[PDB]
Amino acid sequence: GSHMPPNRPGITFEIGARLEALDYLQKWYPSRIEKIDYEEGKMLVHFERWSHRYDEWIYWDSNRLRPLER
Numbered sequence: 744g745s746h747m748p749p750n751r752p753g754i755t756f757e758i759g760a761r762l763e764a765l766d767y768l769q770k771w772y773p774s775r776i777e778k779i780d781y782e783e784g785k786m787l788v789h790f791e792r793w794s795h796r797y798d799e800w801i802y803w804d805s806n807r808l809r810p811l812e813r
Contacts, residue, residue, distance in 0.1 A: 745781040748803055753810025756786075756803070764788045765807040766797070773811070779803075 748756040756779060764774040777798060778787035785802045789795060801807055 746784055748779075748781075748784075751803070751808070751810075753813065754808060761791075761811055762788075763809050763811060764790065764799070764801065765809075766790060766799075771809070 754760070754762050756776070758776055758779065760776050762774055762776070763771045765771055772790045772793075774788045774790050776786050777789045780786070780800075783802075784804070785800045787798055788801050788808075789798045
């Protein structure tokens with residue numbers, strides 16, 4: 744079934760919402776949520792300024808996600 748997203752401080756689980764993501768080369772980038780899979784519990788993250796070929800599915804409990812600084 745579809746799952747309510749976890750409580751994650753500072754992250755809004757909406758399409759287009761911004762956050763920072765750690766890419767596969769271990770650098771943080773401002774990013775936005777492209778898609779949310781509520782069944783598998785993961786989101787398609789787009790790294791801002793970069794090609795969509797780098798869009799990555801990240802599980803929504805991942806420590807590779809952090810909120811923007813408020």
